[PDB]
Ligand binder design. Structure first.
Ligand SMILES: Nc1nc2c(ncn2[C@@H]2O[C@H](COP(=O)(O)OP(=O)(O)OP(=O)(O)O)[C@@H](O)[C@H]2O)c(=O)[nH]1
Ligand SMILES: Nc1nc2c(ncn2[C@@H]2O[C@H](COP(=O)(O)OP(=O)(O)O)[C@@H](O)[C@H]2O)c(=O)[nH]1
Ligand SMILES: [Ca+2]
Ligand SMILES: [Mg+2]
Ligand SMILES: [Mg+2]
Lengths: 440, 422, 69
């Protein structure tokens, strides 16, 4: 037991899901058909990978996942693709018409036609679990399904699974790859609506990923495949805790205890190193100290903000590969003396650290070099609030003139939900201010 | 499949619609029988958006051809691709309109409307998931403008939650002498402001001026004007017709482009008119490449779509679109962030290695509405030719309401043009 | 202390149930309000398109009346 069910919503959730599940299959030696030679228990087991994979009698290893979109074309590509054999058709759920970049359509008008069916299929996965730990929900802030359907589902999941943990991976919009002017509206609405229903949410700023691909991988104009390949390494780092075990492995829920000092303050900043091309990795050993240092360079962050100008409430480091404790200690020593790392006064200690011995993996024909060792840092900084300030600003500039609001009103919303969502985000920006002020 | 149902009405409407169908049929690699005789799969991926299948793998435009004049139906049928259309979809009157709007909208158009409607339903009811309608027509004649609008109301009633998109040809003294056109255009606009979601203003004024001044064409035919229009139509529908991210259906487009429901009249733009990416880009934002006869520099853009076609560098496109907004920051309202979107389709049109199509919702479009309004107010003040319309049952009041609704629209564009972030 | 242990577990179950009930109710009030509102806007859209058919009756009538002079 300790199963997790992954739910992938809208185009972004779906494509990122593909990327993740391919990565997980390579990491565990699972084949596109689902067969896994090294797995000698057939039809089941309680091995660490079974947190994410069920097994059929026929020796198939099947993702504990649901993919949902209001439009079939992205999911049709999984149905007919490299990995179609992996999923059972009923895990791939599609509608005929999308939300049209409109939260209201994802939450109400189109979403309500399919929500009962989605909860059903989820229910069938929960029933195959001896001790369900929770959900991982992948989606964009900006699309209509990503925003509005996801928040409807989170609401409904709180109803049918109580307070069973719900973690999010959320794509925060960026102008280089955005598809809609109203992404700020959808962003604030889904965040407002999801906030009480989620235990921990990792934001990925598309601009930040975009930049890292350009700077550290010399990719001129990154595509969603470039981005999702990167994102999935970060996701893999985070989930690796669960799908593997080893003496010094430290479970995601233990990090969580440290990352969330207050229910609303549940948005950790992720950073990942190393991101390097094969061409530059050749004859270059990146030591533990180098990849650790890289964690505190703001340009390796997955959300653009500046932690140097904020305060830390937690630092968690998830090492993978060829790492031993002696080197980590030295690395952290160096950083403490030579960096701007200010903790709030109510958290005297501090840093928390784990190592997964299993080495990082890359996908064939990817841009990422294969490295011996890697690290993901999750920190809880007040600087992540900058990301909300920027969105909130974009929201206000439009809302003041009610630009595009009639698209939402014609689907049944009221101006009162906009102002209410925005007020909630004002408060959240205030909460990130208050936690950072010193005690008396 | 997210299907669109096409409706061409009147002479203008049928000329341009036929052109449109020739052009894109060529782009999808389908001949006048209706067979795919093509090279690549990009061509057929979203062909259902515009084409029905029949067996014998034929492809049939999901199209409905309408006129009160019976003749135009033969010119169409004889034209290239005339035999690709569905014969039952031809729906002709006998009388003809003679440039009287009230005939098209209130009397002789009303007689015929029910049977167009019968075809529309038939076509709508086969659709896996109808997205909506696009109508080609002129606002100067009497059928395309008057029956065209009546259809719009009528369809909007049976399908209120579908997107209603027009290609509306605006009238110019330079192209047609027909003294009564500013009446038909004003009454049509009155309808369109209330009942379409998105309308591309294809202006005869600007099509003339590009044909005269740019193309060196001393006296230009409809066949030249429409050569521009078909290039445009192909361009603004590229995102609907091939795989892509941006504005891939009529609703996502309305949502990106229409911040206020009434402000839904667009300046299309094309380049090159007959290159490197910086040239395409600078040109497409030029007042001289605008299919509506407005100067963008006299207003502000609320939103813009921009589509590039050809094999080119996407990095180069990105930098250039950044460059244009930076150097021209004043002409984009600041209170709608990131209001310019850009798409790139690898497939260029025919004959070009790369092109750029533009779609702006600029407040300078009030220049077009003012020009009509002047022309219209020249007549109505000295109640001229009004007997053609009171004749068919109308009251003067309606002429007035159509007037102060078009002035209202002009002052709304002004109001948002003048608005600041504080 | 035994009865305080009972109270604490009773309080947890109660808060959890509450949270589920309130979320269940918030949600179903939002889906009702949304449906009224949407339907209401479609209604008004159709009434307006009606009044157009009642003006077009009253026009076609107006014409057959002046056409007996
Ligand atoms: N990182 C990443 N972002 C994506 C991907 N696909 C879309 N996006 C981003 O997601 C946002 C758009 O939402 P989508 O996820 O496309 O929309 P949707 O959830 O399918 O909602 P509708 O299409 O409106 O029904 C924009 O910020 C896009 O840049 C992807 O594969 N990876
Ligand atoms: N660009 C363009 N404009 C046209 C064409 N045919 C007619 N027009 C314009 O349409 C208006 C007349 O409408 P028409 O379609 O002929 O009227 P109807 O058929 O009675 O609705 C005039 O202002 C013409 O200049 C055409 O093929 N191309
Ligand atoms: Ca097993
Ligand atoms: Mg989508
Ligand atoms: Mg005519």
């Amino acid at each position: 037991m300790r199963e997790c069910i992954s739910i992938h919503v809208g185009q972004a959730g779906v494509q990122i899901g593909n990327a993740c599940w391919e990565l997980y299959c390579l990491e565990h030696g699972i084949q596109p058909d689902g067969q896994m030679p090294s797995d000698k228990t057939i039809g089941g087991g309680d091995d660490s990978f079974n947190t994410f994979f069920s097994e059929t009698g026929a020796g198939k290893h099947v993702p504990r996942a649901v993919f949902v979109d209001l439009e079939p074309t992205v999911i049709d590509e999984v149905r007919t693709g490299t990995y179609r054999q992996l999923f059972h058709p009923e895990q791939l759920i599609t509608g005929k018409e999308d939300a049209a970049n409109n939260y209201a359509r994802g939450h109400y008008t189109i979403g309500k036609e399919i929500i009962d069916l989605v909860l059903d299929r989820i229910r069938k996965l929960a029933d195959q679990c001896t001790g369900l730990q929770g959900f991982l929900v992948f989606h964009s802030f900006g699309g209509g399904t990503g925003s509005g359907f996801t928040s409807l589902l989170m609401e409904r999941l709180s109803v049918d699974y109580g307070k069973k943990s719900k973690l999010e991976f959320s794509i925060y919009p960026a102008p280089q790859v955005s598809t809609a002017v109203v992404e700020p509206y959808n962003s604030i609405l889904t965040t407002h609506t999801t906030l009480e229903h989620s235990d921990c949410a990792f934001m990925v700023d598309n601009e930040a990923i975009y930049d890292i691909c350009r700077r550290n991988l010399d990719i001129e104009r990154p595509t969603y495949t470039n981005l999702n390949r990167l994102i999935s390494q970060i996701v893999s780092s985070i989930t690796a805790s669960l799908r593997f075990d080893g003496a010094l492995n430290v479970d995601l829920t233990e990090f969580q205890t440290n990352l969330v000092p207050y229910p609303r303050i549940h948005f950790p900043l992720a950073t990942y190193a190393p991101v390097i091309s094969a061409e530059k990795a050749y004859h270059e050993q990146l030591s533990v100290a180098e990849i650790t240092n890289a964690c505190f360079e703001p340009a390796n962050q997955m959300v653009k903000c500046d932690p140097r100008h904020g305060k830390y409430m937690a630092c968690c480091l998830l090492y993978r590969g060829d790492v031993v404790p002696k080197d980590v200690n030295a690395a952290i020593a160096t950083i403490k003396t030579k960096r701007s790392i200010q903790f709030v006064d109510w958290c005297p200690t501090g840093f928390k650290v784990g190592i997964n011995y299993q080495p990082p993996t890359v996908v064939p024909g990817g841009d990422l070099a294969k490295v011996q060792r890697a690290v993901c840092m999750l920190s809880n900084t007040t600087a992540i609030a900058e990301a909300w300030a920027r969105l909130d600003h974009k929201f206000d500039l439009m809302y003041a003139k009610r630009a595009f609001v009639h698209w939402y009103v014609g689907e049944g919303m009221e101006e009162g939900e906009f102002s209410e969502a925005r007020e909630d985000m004002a408060a959240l920006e205030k909460d990130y201010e208050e936690v950072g002020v010193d005690s008396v | 499949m997210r299907e669109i149902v096409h409706i061409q009405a009147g002479q203008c409407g049928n000329q341009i619609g036929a052109k449109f169908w020739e052009v894109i049929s060529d782009e999808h690699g389908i001949d006048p029988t209706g067979s795919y005789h093509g090279d690549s799969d990009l061509q057929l991926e979203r062909i259902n958006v515009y084409y029905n299948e029949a067996a014998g793998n034929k492809y049939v435009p999901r199209a409905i051809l309408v006129d009160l004049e019976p003749g135009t139906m033969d010119s169409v049928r004889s034209g290239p691709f005339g035999q690709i259309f569905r014969p039952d979809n031809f729906v002709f009157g006998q009388s003809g309109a003679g440039n009287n709007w009230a005939k098209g909208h209130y009397t002789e158009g009303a007689e015929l409307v029910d049977s167009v409607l019968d075809v529309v339903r038939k076509e709508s009811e086969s659709c896996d998931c109808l997205q909506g309608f696009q109508l080609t027509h002129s606002l100067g004649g009497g059928t395309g403008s008057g029956m065209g609008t009546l259809l719009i109301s009528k369809i909007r009633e049976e399908y209120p939650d579908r997107i209603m998109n027009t290609f509306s040809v605006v009238p110019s003294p330079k192209v047609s002498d027909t003294v009564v056109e500013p009446y038909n255009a004003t009454l049509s606009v009155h309808q369109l402001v209330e009942n379409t979601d998105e309308t591309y203003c294809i202006d005869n004024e600007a099509l003339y001026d590009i044909c005269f001044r740019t193309l060196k064409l001393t006296t230009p035919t409809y066949g030249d004007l429409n050569h521009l229009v078909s290039a445009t139509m192909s361009g603004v529908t590229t995102c609907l017709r091939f795989p892509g991210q941006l504005n891939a259906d009529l609703r996502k487009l309305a949502v990106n482009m229409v911040p206020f429901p009434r402000l839904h009249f667009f300046m299309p733009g094309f380049a090159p008119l007959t290159l490197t990416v910086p040239e395409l880009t600078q040109q497409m934002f030029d007042a001289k490449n605008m299919m509506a006869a407005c100067d963008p520099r006299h207003g502000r853009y609320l939103t813009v779509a921009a589509v590039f076609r050809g094999r080119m560098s996407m990095k180069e496109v990105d930098e250039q679109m950044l460059n244009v907004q930076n150097k021209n920051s004043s002409y984009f309202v600041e209170w709608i962030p990131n209001n310019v979107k850009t798409a790139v389709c690898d497939i260029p049109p025919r004959g070009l290695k790369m092109s750029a199509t533009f779609i702006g919702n600029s407040t300078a479009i009030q220049e077009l509405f003012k020009r009509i309004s002047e022309q219209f107010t020249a007549m109505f003040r000295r109640k001229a030719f009004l007997h053609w319309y009171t004749g068919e049952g109308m009251d003067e009041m309606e002429f007035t309401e159509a007037e102060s609704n078009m002035n209202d629209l002009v002052s709304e564009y002004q109001q948002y043009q003048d608005a600041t972030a504080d | 202390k035994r009865e305080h242990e009972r109270e604490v577990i009773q309080k947890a179950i109660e808060e959890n149930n509450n949270f589920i009930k309130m979320a269940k109710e918030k949600l179903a009030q939002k889906m009702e309000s949304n449906k009224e509102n949407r339907e209401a806007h479609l209604a008004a859209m159709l009434e307006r398109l009606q009044e157009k058919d009642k003006h077009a009756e009253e026009v076609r009538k107006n014409k057959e009346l002046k056409e007996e002079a």
